[PDB]
Amino acid sequence: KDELLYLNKAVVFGSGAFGTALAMVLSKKCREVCVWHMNEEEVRLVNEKRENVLFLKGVQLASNITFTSDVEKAYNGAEIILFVIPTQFLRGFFEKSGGNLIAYAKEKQVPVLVCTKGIERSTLKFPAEIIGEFLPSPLLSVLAGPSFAIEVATGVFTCVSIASADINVARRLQRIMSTGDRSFVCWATTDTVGCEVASAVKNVLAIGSGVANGLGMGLNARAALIMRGLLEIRDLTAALGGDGSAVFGLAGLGDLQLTCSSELSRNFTVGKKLGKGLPIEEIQRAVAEGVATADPLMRLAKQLKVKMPLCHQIYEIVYKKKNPRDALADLLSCGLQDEGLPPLFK
Amino acid sequence: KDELLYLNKAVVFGSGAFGTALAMVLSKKCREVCVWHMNEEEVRLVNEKRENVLFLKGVQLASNITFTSDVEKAYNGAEIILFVIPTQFLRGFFEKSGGNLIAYAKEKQVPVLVCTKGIERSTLKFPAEIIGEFLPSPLLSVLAGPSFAIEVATGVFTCVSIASADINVARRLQRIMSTGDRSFVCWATTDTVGCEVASAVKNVLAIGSGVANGLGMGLNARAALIMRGLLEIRDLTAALGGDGSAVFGLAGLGDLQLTCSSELSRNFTVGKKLGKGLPIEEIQRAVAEGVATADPLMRLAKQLKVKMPLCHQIYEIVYKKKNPRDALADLLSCGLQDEGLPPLFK
Numbered sequence A, B: 001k002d003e004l005l006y007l008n009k010a011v012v013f014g015s016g017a018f019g020t021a022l023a024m025v026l027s028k029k030c031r032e033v034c035v036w037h038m039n040e041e042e043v044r045l046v047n048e049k050r051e052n053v054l055f056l057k058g059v060q061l062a063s064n065i066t067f068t069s070d071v072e073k074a075y076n077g078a079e080i081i082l083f084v085i086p087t088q089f090l091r092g093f094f095e096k097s098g099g100n101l102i103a104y105a106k107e108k109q110v111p112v113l114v115c116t117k118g119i120e121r122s123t124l125k126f127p128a129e130i131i132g133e134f135l136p137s138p139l140l141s142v143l144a145g146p147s148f149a150i151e152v153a154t155g156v157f158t159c160v161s162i163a164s165a166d167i168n169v170a171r172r173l174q175r176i177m178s179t180g181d182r183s184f185v186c187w188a189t190t191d192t193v194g195c196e197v198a199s200a201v202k203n204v205l206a207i208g209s210g211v212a213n214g215l216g217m218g219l220n221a222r223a224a225l226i227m228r229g230l231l232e233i234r235d236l237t238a239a240l241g242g243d244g245s246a247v248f249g250l251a252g253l254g255d256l257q258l259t260c261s262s263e264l265s266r267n268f269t270v271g272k273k274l275g276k277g278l279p280i281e282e283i284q285r286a287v288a289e290g291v292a293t294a295d296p297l298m299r300l301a302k303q304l305k306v307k308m309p310l311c312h313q314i315y316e317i318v319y320k321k322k323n324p325r326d327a328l329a330d331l332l333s334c335g336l337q338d339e340g341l342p343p344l345f346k
């Protein structure tokens, strides 16, 4: 079925730039959209100003979007649930405030869409995996793709992928998330692991992209970093049991090339400053997602025995004071090799 | 062997920006480098000025690079031959001036490296295929990857792939083209067809990237165009008998993402003007490579029965006056689909 689905209510848990942008997307497909945000005082400000002045400045919220600090009112009556709570707070949220939410989702069979990106430090688990400890996995999908929040929020043409182990679940979500003006287009896939890996690793590679710029390198270098870094996303995906079909799609290469070309982003400027020779302590006086991800990414790579050359060198630069030029020369000391891509056709 | 190879002489046939940049690369690996250019008066100017003032302004040529209008002196003693003659003049060159050159290359077993990109209008053949009508295919390699000429010419870090049916030939060329300071790095592959397809199609997609910008779309759109367009490079590669291992490497995605992000390039500005609604005749008052490639690309796609949605719509906009917004809506009238990538892992 290529016919779109419209709903009475959607709830978005998480009030960041991306969460708000998706609320904008859902406001064209659901009569009512609640965005949950824990601080009551800030919720009131946002509803009065008709604008997420904290994380999406300069964008007018649709009149059918309401911010709320009350979990129970947020999800009550919802026909789709989105999670964009940052990784570190996910488990705590379900433990402290998810009891009724979980019961409701279980009972009503409400589709859940995971948009959180990262790796949990204590378990080295990805967001949809964490959420799957609480909500039955058949209800779980992942959304990932090249999607700057501001472009998504103002309706500028965007393609994403929706991943689900059962393709038919992804296909239902496709009908819900895709807009009537074709401004937001969704492609179905099975590769939830690939999506989640790409989403986490892209942020670490975007620091490297910054390093390259601060070292004096140009766009050829950035293009090579993307291509070689994609192979590390692939190998980690394999080791984690993923089928890998998202790696070379919108969730993998698509989001990765966009994130690494984002010159004004926090990951990039942190990487640029490191490339220019500044120590991380001086840069740290919000944290860049790549900085946070690099340590548990390394720990996970080591546990699975997956070599991630670029990501490892980025970890060394960020966490272990390594000179970026020594890291570059270490990277380039492997000698001449084959590209390392299998043939597609026999 | 990871040890580099150094040579007495290299010859580069073709004096464009890219050809000159590669002469700069070879000047660090060969004692002598000749760059052939047919006009004697312009050859004299370039040698006096120590600068390709016609196609690489502002870059000082290495002292061991000599421009020449004499084919016989150009190749005499060369241990590697590069071709960067534009596609339309390739056959004519061999027919009119290649007789002795071919004999020499055959007799001395001199490696030939194809860097020309495009499709010949009369035969719908790719450059290495044309050259292979004259020089034995075992001597033939293709160079392709993300490589802006100016960045390559001034020694800024660049990775390319070298493709050859016999991987061992690619591996020898790898040792010749890779520089001692690791500023120019080469990766070996077998996928000559994929390289040549990517090289031709990227120029047509870069027009579309322009169209997207002129229509008001943003970076999310560009990222989606790259990803979907890569699938058209893949399908045309399959149909042509290529193994496809370069499609997702430096020659494919790598070069494609760089070319489509090149805002100041001729392909992009032509596409931008078309997106803003200007007719092609008004824009045409040099030709953009994407404009030239689009017609024979379509004819080749039709002959092989390969559907190339984006490329077809770009052809319609360029050649058949089609409104870019009707083309976009036609593209987006296919309904909701799966991403169309096979799993990597079972």
Ligand SMILES: CCCCCCCCCCCCCCCC(=O)O
Pocket (backbone or CB within 6 Å): A208, A209, A211, A212, A217, A221, A222, A224, A225, A228, A309, A310, A313, A314, A317, A324, A327, A328, A331, A332, A334, B159
């Ligand atoms: C962590 C340093 C970041 C600097 C950015 C370098 C620019 C991209 C370099 C890509 C080439 C990587 C070569 C890897 C070789 C290997 O497989 O071990």
Ligand SMILES: CCCCCCCCCCCCCCCC(=O)O
Pocket (backbone or CB within 6 Å): A159, B208, B209, B211, B212, B217, B221, B222, B224, B225, B228, B309, B310, B313, B314, B317, B324, B327, B328, B331, B332, B334
């Ligand atoms: C030729 C028009 C160029 C305008 C650029 C559009 C921006 C990228 C659009 C990518 C989505 C393409 C959808 C193709 C669907 C299909 O497989 O038929």
Ligand SMILES: Clc1nc(Br)nc2nc[nH]c12
Pocket (backbone or CB within 6 Å): A038, A085, A089, A092, A093
């Ligand atoms: Cl404790 C906590 N929980 C959630 Br959900 N989000 C937060 N943001 C800051 N602290 C937070």
Ligand SMILES: Clc1nc(Br)nc2nc[nH]c12
Pocket (backbone or CB within 6 Å): A155, A157, A180, A181, A182, A183
């Ligand atoms: Cl998203 C969108 N934008 C413009 Br401009 N025109 C359209 N027509 C249908 N969907 C459209």
Ligand SMILES: Clc1nc(Br)nc2nc[nH]c12
Pocket (backbone or CB within 6 Å): A157, A181, A182, A183, B215, B216, B217, B325, B326, B328, B329
């Ligand atoms: Cl999504 C979309 N569709 C059409 Br038709 N035209 C556009 N121009 C910008 N975005 C557009």
Ligand SMILES: Clc1nc(Br)nc2nc[nH]c12
Pocket (backbone or CB within 6 Å): B038, B085, B089, B092, B093
């Ligand atoms: Cl006829 C001809 N041959 C070659 Br090689 N290059 C050219 N450039 C313009 N006309 C040309």
Ligand SMILES: Clc1nc(Br)nc2nc[nH]c12
Pocket (backbone or CB within 6 Å): B155, B157, B180, B181, B182, B183
């Ligand atoms: Cl290409 C290159 N550039 C710089 Br800066 N330093 C180097 N050291 C070895 N190769 C190098």
Ligand SMILES: Clc1nc(Br)nc2nc[nH]c12
Pocket (backbone or CB within 6 Å): A215, A216, A217, A325, A326, A328, A329, B157, B181, B182, B183
């Ligand atoms: Cl190629 C290269 N190598 C090293 Br070490 N450092 C650099 N800085 C810029 N390019 C560089």
